[PDB]
Assembly symmetry: C3
Homo-oligomer: 333 residues x 3
Amino acid sequence: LKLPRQKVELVAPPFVHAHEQATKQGPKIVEFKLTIEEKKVVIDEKGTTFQAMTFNGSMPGPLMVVHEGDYVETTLVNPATNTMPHNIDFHSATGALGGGALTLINPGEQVVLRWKATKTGVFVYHCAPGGPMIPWHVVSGMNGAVMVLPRDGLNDGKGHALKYDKVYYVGEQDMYVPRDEKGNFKSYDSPGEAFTDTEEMMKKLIPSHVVFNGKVGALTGKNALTANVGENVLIVHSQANRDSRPHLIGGHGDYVWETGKFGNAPEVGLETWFIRGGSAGAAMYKFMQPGIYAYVTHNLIEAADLGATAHFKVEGKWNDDLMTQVKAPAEIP
Amino acid sequence: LKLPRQKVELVAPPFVHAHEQATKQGPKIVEFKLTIEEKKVVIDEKGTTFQAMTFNGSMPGPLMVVHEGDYVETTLVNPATNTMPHNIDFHSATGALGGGALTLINPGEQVVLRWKATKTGVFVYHCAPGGPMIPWHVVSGMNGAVMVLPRDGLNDGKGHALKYDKVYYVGEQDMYVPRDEKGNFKSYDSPGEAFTDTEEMMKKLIPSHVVFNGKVGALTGKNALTANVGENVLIVHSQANRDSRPHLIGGHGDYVWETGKFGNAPEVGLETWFIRGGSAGAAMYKFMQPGIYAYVTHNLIEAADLGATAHFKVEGKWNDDLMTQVKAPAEIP
Amino acid sequence: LKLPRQKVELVAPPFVHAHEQATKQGPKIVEFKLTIEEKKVVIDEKGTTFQAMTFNGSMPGPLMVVHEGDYVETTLVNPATNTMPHNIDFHSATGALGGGALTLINPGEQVVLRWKATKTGVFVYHCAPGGPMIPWHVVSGMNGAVMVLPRDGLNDGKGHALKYDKVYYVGEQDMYVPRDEKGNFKSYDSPGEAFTDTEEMMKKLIPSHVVFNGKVGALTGKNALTANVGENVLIVHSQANRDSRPHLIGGHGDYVWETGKFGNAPEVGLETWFIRGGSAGAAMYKFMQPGIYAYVTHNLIEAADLGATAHFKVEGKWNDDLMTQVKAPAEIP
Ligand SMILES: OC[C@H]1O[C@](O)(CO)[C@@H](O)[C@@H]1O
Ligand SMILES: OC[C@H]1O[C@](O)(CO)[C@@H](O)[C@@H]1O
Ligand SMILES: OC[C@H]1O[C@](O)(CO)[C@@H](O)[C@@H]1O
Ligand SMILES: [Cu+2]
Ligand SMILES: [Cu+2]
Ligand SMILES: [Cu+2]
Ligand SMILES: [Cu+2]
Ligand SMILES: [Cu+2]
Ligand SMILES: [Cu+2]
């Protein structure tokens, strides 16, 4: 394979490495490195801990962006400081269990996989070492996404280009943290020590936490998502194990690929869309009003009580035609 | 804003206030009033009670119907006989958390919000006072829907009008009623007294009841939905917090907008469709056979055991070409 | 009704009785027989038993295949060796609760129902005897599917034929097996004896097992699904009671009707699709690589831990352009 090589410097979510939408480049070999990190992290404002397993140190793993017909060459590294075997399965890829059957590496090893990006869209990638380890590694955080853009950029299915001003990647994680007898969340010294209790809970299918970007409140405050009135924002949403129903409170999905695949035209003007577990989807919105927005899964129990709320802080001029407080709160006549 | 004003007299679900489909009217300011009522209600045939919180006294709140480009001016009233603050978030609206950030009212107050109906479809509206109160108020019953029709009425995406003879609004409600030690449903003296136990249950994500129109059996018997053979019926279905999968037993969805948005063409000939939690969808069916139909969510446990069954009673002539009992039950030869 | 009659010899899933895709036949009366069998079966590799109730002895019931405009004439037989009344509801059919209101038969009886196949797609059929028996009979295994093909075969919505080389039917079953105090699965002497404990569990909405073709591992080993590189395989997936999210690990859904209805164009290039509870869907894939594939629901806990994994074993030549192991596992430099 004698194509040009291009290195990408990955960046942590919710940001996305610089890329072109429409491009005049032809196919390349695009080189990525992912280094697995097992680590104990804090997942909520109460200080609950969690035995995480990650690509590149983050939940989700970083978004990889290429174009249709590129070859994606990933160096997967499992440092000796980890305890378990790991691999990678790309839903964008064809053959060998998405790459999983060619990438199983023990601590101290690395492997190099190349796959041709023949399918456009956003896709999950995740670890899948075999058997009961598959769900455990995924719900411990070992999942991310890849975006395979058409070379001509995105379109509306009616001949018109859809160009985003910025893209964010929201990875949603269902987490299963067991409780002790008195009802407090348990802490564990290693992923292996967490496994028995965590699997017992997993099989009951109810998460303790549902978070964006690895933690309750990760995408709020200093780390709120941002936009300006007039900006078209693409929001890629993934969930490797469990369904989600994204909703932008105060906005819409102007153009939505809920199954996440750009060979299909987007749907228009959605209130809430649906990310099937094991997939990524994408929604574009042009902001029309300034202020705070919440971006949630619209199981509101999950959103408000289990962790699944992000914010956008949007700058610009208020549009009284679109919405106005005609009369402020006042005593009932 | 110097447009004509038009008042609407809302009606309780499953009925829908009189409206035009295609219209020659231009944009108007359409005026609605919603008065919040907190009240203890009975939700099943066993006499289980429930601390409900409602718009206009009903679960769901009434369906509001306007056309694209209208301005919707809602007077939201929170009488002093209630105990909690409330607000309203319209998924149809743009800005200020759907209106929620402009409509928080204490008992004894009212507020007037106007929003421009720039997106067509059926949409959820719900209370969303902030934080953990958001899911609690929604699952206590504070949700309804609005329908924003194209000015030319509905179409099939192929150039042809789709005119309904009647429309019904089915609001589905997941309810979380705690049990005592011996396994009976608990009763509470106030919503505030119900909150701690109810939140603990909510976070476990399994409802005790799933009902249409506020109660097991609400849309059966005297209150069955009705039609005649030959009539095209539009069924709007909403679920503000949790997924549903509507199905008309003995029928189909001839034309279905499962994501609920009229900028998209309907799907045709469905058996079962999917309402993502936090959304409304709509399905049209032309009845071809008389008799009893059941309209359910097709988790049949929810439908038959947790409350989520409505009936249609349909008049007209049986069509033996479409279906016939060739041989009645008889002993096996 | 003076049309030609054609008998079909049904075959057990995942296989499908021989049929034409495009056909020059006109409408016929197509005759099927289903004989109900209640039986205790083993559902996992641990030897857990289950009080099953089945059409034709299998879970799922066999796939019935006809063409648009055919009349489907089913002899439903409830032998005296069974204990309960049963019936059949076809989601493909119009009127009388899908046929259920015309087919209730006691042990020792049979009935003959005819329905006209006016809607194309794949559809669920299931037992539905009334009230709380409806979910119980369905989750005990009394569900299958029917496929109603266009007379011109399948198409891509763009004018082009889609011809499958083979079709498989994957019926997914949520099962509710109670546990005793010490945590072992219970065994029962009859379906009636299992009912009280099984209903109590059903209402909590969490299955103990989620299986394909009636058992953990049913579609693995000797009984793996098969294909060759170059073959277009249609996979019909049904779930009569609960949502599923199919995914072919290492492949895609080239053409997918996730709502399962051929009046709608397929979506293209999916990673994971969604089968709403109470429906069947269908996905076509042309295999490009040899080796083992897993076909799962992509709640990976369900797939790996509760039973919901099938395999494909695919023969042919490996395509290094699509995927290659550039560097095998090696020590990190
Ligand atoms: O946006 C993707 C869609 O747009 C088109 O190219 C033009 O309508 C379709 O062929 C494709 O499905
Ligand atoms: O019914 C809505 C659909 O119908 C059309 O106007 C004509 O095909 C489309 O542009 C739109 O998506
Ligand atoms: O494949 C089914 C689809 O294909 C068409 O016949 C041609 O585009 C549509 O009318 C139909 O929805
Ligand atoms: Cu791993
Ligand atoms: Cu996967
Ligand atoms: Cu409220
Ligand atoms: Cu909302
Ligand atoms: Cu039965
Ligand atoms: Cu059914």
